[PDB]
């Protein structure tokens, strides 16, 4: 019927939006998940619109 799957109820693992490594941390400001202080520093210095570009790979962009 072309209607054929449903979301999981298992809780979701957290991965770094930049590097895909496991992420302990969720940035409050930019909503990116990040692995460590090195990537938090880089995340806060992204060019305009690059934060949304990282959310797009997760399918989580603002629209």
């Amino acid at each position: 019927t072309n209607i054929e799957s449903a979301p999981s109820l298992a809780p979701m693992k957290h991965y770094c939006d930049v590097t895909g490594l496991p992420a302990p941390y969720l940035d409050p400001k930019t909503r990116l998940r990040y692995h460590n202080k090195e990537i938090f520093a880089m995340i806060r210095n992204l060019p305009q619109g690059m934060g949304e570009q990282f959310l797009e790979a997760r399918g989580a962009h603002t629209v």
Partner: protein, 443 residues
């Protein structure tokens, strides 16, 4: 601080070359006793290597010849990395438990189990907490937290919301979370939020924000003695008896289980065994029943090294009516080696008085030091060291900047030494209460 200047405060160690064990004529606060300090240095090597179990060493010598000083030196040169138990023999005579129980407990305090455990710990300044209570509370909440290097939001589980509301966490608090267990410790308050803390009094201190990763695998090293494991296992909150002291006579089958369990942990590598040392000061105050116990408590792989000090000559053993060297039975002295401490020469007396005068805040003129050295030879090292404090107080009352001979002479006149005090009782014999209880009150 809290730690005041005690009799031994100047002793920082044994004063011994780590390469050769040659004692230096003065260092780390110990003067002379070189042959004795060398032997005590050999004992530290045995203690630190852990290989040998249940050696007993006796430090034998006249009073005030540095037997305790050398014992303090060893404690200071082992440091906190090894169990060091200091027992006055008078303490074994408990009413809570038998003498042999008290000796078992003292031995068990002197073997350590060293255990290494990691935890993830989260530490940072709280940027924000919001909690929604609906109305029963703890329905949901969010924590924002930062270091200087990172910032994060956390969705909180309801028991973490209870931990947060219990510890009254508020914006600006610097907290640590042991997330394997969820206790919050409020390390402090950020200075950057000082105006928010309207209820905190002006005496309140403020910290800087933490730094680095919000989460770290901190590794903790614990040492727990065999006695602590025994007491824990004695009753439902047995560990409390490690503080109130009302341990009964802990049953020996409990200890044997623990001895087996610890050997298991050693072979699995879950734990390491750290043999310490038991120091028994005035070992001559033990009785004949104690000595026959100690004989066989030494013959065990979980025996510490034992160190003992005695002033006694050929003297009566307690609990019997005959006399033996050091006051100790020959049956026991067979399993002991003796380190003997000698009286000091005058140049050593001068140095010890100088070190004691520098440990105390005392500016001492050279002639006062010479006079105190003469008194030391004639009245004993302890009496001369007691006169240092006195003369400082006398000099201070006349506003003097240095302790002069004048001040030492007031002290010598005001406070009798032992020998002068013995003469006083002999000349005052009819006025003092004699051993027959007789005394005369009349002029």
């Amino acid at each position: 601080g809290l730690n005041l200047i005690a009799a031994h405060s100047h002793i920082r160690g044994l004063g011994v070359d780590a390469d050769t064990l040659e004692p230096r004529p003065s260092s780390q606060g110990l003067v002379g006793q070189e042959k004795a300090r060398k032997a005590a240095a050999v004992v530290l090597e045995m203690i630190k290597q852990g290989k040998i179990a249940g050696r007993a060493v006796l430090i034998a010598g006249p009073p005030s010849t540095g037997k305790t000083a050398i014992a303090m030196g060893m404690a200071q040169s082992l440091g906190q990395d090894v169990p060091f138990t200091t027992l006055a023999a008078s303490e074994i005579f408990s009413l809570e438990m038998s003498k042999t129980e008290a000796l078992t407990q003292a031995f068990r305090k002197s073997i350590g189990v060293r255990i290494k455990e990691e935890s993830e710990i989260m530490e940072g300044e709280v940027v924000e907490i919001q909690i929604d209570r609906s109305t029963g509370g703890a329905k949901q909440g969010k924590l924002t937290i930062k270091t200087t290097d990172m910032e994060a939001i956390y969705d909180m589980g309801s028991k973490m919301i209870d931990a947060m509301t219990k510890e009254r966490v508020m914006a600006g608090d610097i907290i640590s979370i042991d997330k394997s267990s969820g206790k919050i410790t409020k390390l402090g308050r950020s200075y950057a939020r000082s105006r928010d803390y309207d209820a905190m009094g002006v005496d309140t201190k403020f910290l800087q924000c933490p730094e680095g990763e919000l989460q770290k695998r901190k590794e903790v090293v614990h040492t727990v003695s065999l006695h602590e494991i025994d007491v824990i296992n004695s009753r439902t909150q047995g560990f409390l008896a490690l503080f109130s002291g009302d341990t009964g006579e802990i049953r020996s089958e409990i200890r044997d289980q623990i001895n087996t369990k610890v050997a298991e942990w050693k072979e699995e590598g879950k734990a390491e065994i750290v043999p310490g040392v038991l120091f028994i000061d005035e070992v001559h105050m033990l009785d004949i029943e104690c000595f026959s116990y100690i004989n066989r408590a030494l013959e065990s792989d979980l025996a510490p090294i034992v160190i003992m000090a005695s002033n006694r000559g050929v003297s009566r053993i307690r609990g019997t009516d005959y006399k033996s060297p050091h006051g100790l039975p020959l049956d026991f002295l067979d399993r002991v080696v003796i380190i003997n401490t000698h009286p000091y020469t005058p140049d050593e007396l001068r140095q010890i008085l100088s070190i004691r005068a520098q440990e105390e805040e005392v500016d001492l003129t050279p002639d006062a030091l010479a006079l105190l050295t003469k008194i030391g030879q004639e009245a004993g090292l302890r009496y001369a060291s007691n006169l240092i404090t006195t003369s400082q107080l006398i000099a201070a009352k006349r506003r003097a900047k240095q302790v002069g001979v004048e001040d030492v002479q007031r002290s010598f006149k005001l406070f009798y030494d032992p020998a002068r005090s013995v003469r006083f009782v002999q000349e005052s014999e009819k006025r003092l209460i004699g051993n027959d209880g007789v005394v005369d009150f009349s002029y």
